[PDB]
Each structure stands twice: as structure tokens, then as C-alpha cells.
């Protein structure tokens, strides 16, 4: 992602980027001579292309099964005696298998426990959300703050800069926001100087022909 | 191919099969612990499936280029001064590249010289044949007698039989018609005894209802 930032020090920019990170990026998922050899390998069978096409096709198929399952699940209840927790637990049985298959095929298994899906079902049927508004949490990855607090790990960030971090940014500052899992590489460029000129056009002067 | 043959010796059956071979089979083209390893290999990437699909797709594309080329080639002449040899040589230039590409992608290069394609063009425009009737010789492989006499090699067949070849056939005779390139494996089975019974039906007795 790209951002515009003002005059801040590197550590305040780092905290600012970490505030942007938990809702802007998708959640981190760890489950997701020489030139002649490169010419020989690039002329071989393009295995990764067909594995990618197979993965996209089976993700679309499990997604379609999940959409039909959650639609037929939400047609099992109606407004009015039964609690939304009890109604969510009742309609979860008609969709747990397709949800489990879609979370297996998209590597999203430890993001969603059964209790979290039941709480989000209770949340959706309480606030009169459709099946698609239920599924938007599950079809895409989504950002880090969407998930449980044990996955945020906001107290485990590390600021790696060659500059002392109390100095402000300048053109060319690169720093890392490391974590145990990944690292946010941050490059700084100066917003360029603009020279606007003014040009007046006449709205009468927009004239047209029929040729070409 | 399967055939019905009568009471002949093995050598006469062999000559009979060689007479059937030159117009029935396609022409020969030479350019065309353990169980755990088999389970590991059969679970790998199905490379041959996608190479087969790529080959079928590019054969259809070169075939479409060839069909458009030969149609636009035969639209360059009309009946009436110019010889059919000269007209074939004139319209061959607008189709030689797509013909060469289709014969490269279907491994049919030494079957068709330029002179043979020119003679068959002269043959087709002499007898008022359409582009598709020209292309039927080239789109499929076709049998062995369709091609030049240096490819028949009819004086180089070898009769390999465990039985002395002057005996007649019986149920279970297997013999080879070997050549330097391939071999015709011939299995003999007895045509089974039939017991037909007669059953009379009445054409009045065909009565019908509307249910199920």
C-alpha cells in the first residue's frame, strides 16, 4: 500500500503505518551456464500455470458450494421462540461442511474456529444480514484486525532502521517493521514539487465535425 | 481392426490381412515398493493431460489457418489460358506456409513433398474439387497406400507363427506380420455358434398408456 505522511519521526511514522496495517493489508497467512539452465527450465512444462488454474477453479467450486449452503441455511429461519445463538447453532449444521471445505481449500482454517463462526452467525442473523453479508468475512482473506487478538501480536513489532529513529523522514529512508512472522518494508519518497499553470478554455470553443 | 475370414491357411490369411492393411489402418508414423512409487507418481502433476490438450489446441489452430489458407488459395483461380500445373503452382504460394506449419505440427512432414502437394493440387483443381476435398488428404493421417511406393515396403513383411503356416486357422492362433518398423499382431477367435429362436409379435398388440 502507499500512503501520504507529513513531517514525523521514523518511530511515529512506524506507529502510523502499524495503525494502517491492521485494516489495510490482508491478514498474514504462512500457509500461503546459469542463463542456459534458465532457458532450459523456462522452455519446460508450465506446471505452475496449470496448478494455479486448478486452484482457482476449485476455489470457485468450493465457493459456489458455500454460497448455496449458506443461502439454504439462512432460509431455515425467520424473524418472530428461539434465541439467535440457538438459531445460529441450528442453521450451522446445514453449512458446516461446505464452510469447512472452503476454509480448507483457501488455507483459512486457524482463522475461524467453530465458536467464531457461530458468533458471527448470531451476529448476522441478529442484525438481519443476508447470506452474502455473512460470507464476506470468509470468502476473502481480510485484514488482521478482523480476527482474534492472539493473531494481532501488536506488542511484538520491531523497528529496524539504519537512521536513528528520532529523526524525521527524508527522500530515501527505508526501514523495516519486523515481526516474528514477516516484515513490513517501508520506502520513503518525497512528494514532488508541482508547478501548475492555468489555461483558459472557452465552453463555446468546443466545436465538432463528422469526419474521422 | 477386426475382420471375418474363412477357412484359409495362416499364410493366405496373412496376405489377406496385408491387403486389408494398406487401406484400413492409418499409415505408420514413427514420429508419433513399486505400488507406493506408482501411487506417488499418479498423485503428481498430470503433465501428459495438459501437453495433450496443448497439442490438440495447436493442431486445431494450425488446421484453421490451413483451411482459411486453402480456401483463399482456391479463390485465386477459375475455370475457362493457364495449365492446371501452372494454376496449382500459382495458388500453392498462398498456402505453402500454412500447409508446412500444419504438417510440422502433426508430424506429417516426410509424407508430403512439395511436388506431391503440387500434383495433388493439380489433381483437385482438374477434377473441380473444393478446398476441403483437397485438405482431406492432409488433415488426417490416412492409410499407407495413399502415399508413395517407397513407404509401402510390401516386399519386407515377415510371417512369425509358432504354428507351421500351411495349417488353417483355429481358435487361439496368434501370429505376427513383422516389418522393420512395426508388427501386426493377429489374434484369431472362432465365430461362435448361434442358436436363433423365433418369436412372433402382433403389430396390433403394441398398445400404450400415458403413465410413466
Curated annotation (Swiss-Prot), chains A, B:
Residues of the full protein shown: 259 to 515 of 521
Keyword vocabulary terms for this entry: Cell membrane, Developmental protein, Disease variant, Membrane, Transmembrane, Transmembrane helix
Cytoplasmic topological domain: 1-212
Quaternary assembly: Homodimer and heterodimer with VANGL1. Interacts through its C-terminal region with the N-terminal half of DVL1, DVL2 and DVL3. The PDZ domain of DVL1, DVL2 and DVL3 is required for the interaction. Also interacts with the PDZ domains of MAGI3, SCRIB/SCRB1 and FZD3. Interacts with PRICKLE3.
Effect of substituting residue 134 to S: In NTD; the mutation protein completely abrogates interaction with DVL1 compared to wild-type
Effect of mutating residue 60 to C: In NTD; the mutant protein has diminished interaction with DVL1 compared to wild-type
Name of this protein: Vang-like protein 2
Protein origin, superkingdom: Eukaryota
GO CC field: apical cytoplasm; apical plasma membrane; basolateral plasma membrane; cell pole; cell-cell junction; COPII-coated ER to Golgi transport vesicle; glutamatergic synapse; lateral plasma membrane
Disease: Neural tube defects: Congenital malformations of the central nervous system and adjacent structures related to defective neural tube closure during the first trimester of pregnancy. Failure of neural tube closure can occur at any level of the embryonic axis. Common NTD forms include anencephaly, myelomeningocele and spina bifida, which result from the failure of fusion in the cranial and spinal region of the neural tube. NTDs have a multifactorial etiology encompassing both genetic and environmental components.
A GO biological-process term: wound healing
Similarity comment text for this entry: Belongs to the Vang family.
Purpose of the protein: Involved in the control of early morphogenesis and patterning of both axial midline structures and the development of neural plate. Plays a role in the regulation of planar cell polarity, particularly in the orientation of stereociliary bundles in the cochlea. Required for polarization and movement of myocardializing cells in the outflow tract and seems to act via RHOA signaling to regulate this process. Required for cell surface localization of FZD3 and FZD6 in the inner ear.
Amino acid at each position: 500500500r502507499f500512503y501520504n505522511v507529513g513531517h514525523l519521526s521514523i518511530q511515529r511514522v512506524a506507529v502510523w503505518i502499524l495503525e494502517k496495517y491492521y485494516h489495510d493489508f490482508p491478514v498474514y497467512n504462512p500457509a500461503l551456464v546459469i542463463a542456459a539452465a534458465a532457458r532450459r527450465r523456462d522452455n519446460s512444462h508450465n506446471e505452475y500455470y496449470y496448478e494455479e488454474a486448478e486452484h482457482e477453479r476449485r476455489v470457485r467450486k468450493r465457493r459456489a458450494r458455500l454460497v448455496v449452503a449458506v443461502e439454504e441455511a439462512f432460509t431455515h429461519i425467520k424473524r418472530l421462540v428461539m434465541d439467535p445463538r440457538e438459531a445460529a447453532q441450528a442453521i450451522f449444521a446445514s453449512m458446516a461442511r461446505a464452510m469447512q471445505k472452503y476454509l480448507r481449500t483457501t488455507k483459512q482454517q486457524p482463522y475461524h474456529t467453530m465458536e467464531s463462526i457461530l458468533q458471527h452467525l448470531e451476529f448476522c442473523i441478529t442484525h438481519d444480514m443476508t447470506p452474502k453479508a455473512f460470507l464476506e468475512r470468509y470468502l476473502a482473506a481480510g485484514p488482521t484486525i478482523q480476527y482474534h487478538k492472539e493473531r494481532w501480536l501488536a506488542k511484538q513489532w520491531t523497528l529496524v532502521s539504519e537512521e536513528p529513529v528520532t529523526n524525521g523522514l527524508k527522500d530515501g529512508i527505508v526501514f523495516l517493521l519486523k515481526r516474528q512472522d514477516f516484515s513490513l518494508v517501508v520506502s520513503t519518497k518525497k512528494v514532488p514539487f508541482f508547478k501548475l499553470s492555468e489555461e483558459f478554455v472557452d465552453p463555446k470553443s468546443h466545436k465538432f465535425v463528422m469526419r474521422l
